[model samples]
Target: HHHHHFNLPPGNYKKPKLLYCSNGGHFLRIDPDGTVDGTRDRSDQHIQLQLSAESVGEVYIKSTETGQYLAMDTDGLLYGSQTPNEECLFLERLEENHYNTYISKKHAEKNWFVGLKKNGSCKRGPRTHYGQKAILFLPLPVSS
Candidate 1:
């Protein structure tokens, strides 16, 4: 019998993915007014994003369409901007099947989850195990 050793190490990073809301299975989109909506198809350039985390779990979501970063207000408003500032940083809370739930890096202590609410808008809400407003999202496979 022969034992096998992998030739290469799994790289330090992963390919970016699109965030699809678990609530309606829709991809999330950013509006000019900083409103996040989850009623778009994956092909909508506005909803596709590249998630880059240079350091362990510290990440920024950049809009693939607008070339801007996703930022949110402390009170739960989502927007896209030109820089990766305090408001644009978030952590991918890993969950089932390695899916992620985005939470504010600054509000980790307070459980500020990036969530989609009624009428398909994104907001900062409680990070709970279960609820319609739980903000849970499923990462969709990225296509070139």
Candidate 2:
């Protein structure tokens, strides 16, 4: 899997973060506005976010379905997640940045849902046997 990383100074915007695992074992980090930082390379896992030194928040990952993941923010707003198979039909065959936008949009609208994969592996099965579990990290909100 490819892995990429980026660091952002604190700012005042609801930024989007994305981490992509490539089929060829590479990871890529995507920016909040759906852009690649261009300063990193592939790794094992990718993590992206729009955070500032003054901003405080949290990040959590949950399994929505097989081979899928969802990222949530501190206020319980879903920021982004992985896409489903059927939904992938209209897209350009798993473009990381494009899918990131799709997920982020749905999350912002509160219209997103996640499926389950065995042990949270999307490439596997036993869909109904699993449910969503979150991985959470919280940072202190901007202090006065």
List clash counts for every candidate, in order: 0, 24
- Tell me the lDDT of candidate 1: 0.65
Error of 2 at 48 (Å): 1.7
Model 1 TM-score, all chains together: 0.75
Tens-digit lDDT track for model 2 on 67-142?
2333333333332345432222110111221222112222323323222222322221111111222111221122
Q: Give Cα-based local distance difference scores for all models.
A: 0.65, 0.26
lDDT, residue 43, candidate 2: 31
Point out where model 2 deviates above 4 Å.
Answer: 1-13, 18-45, 49-112, 115-118, 123-144
Please list the residue runs of candidate 1 whose C-alpha ends up more than 4 Å from where it truly belongs after superposition.
1-14, 32-34, 96-98, 126-134
TM-score of each: 0.75, 0.19
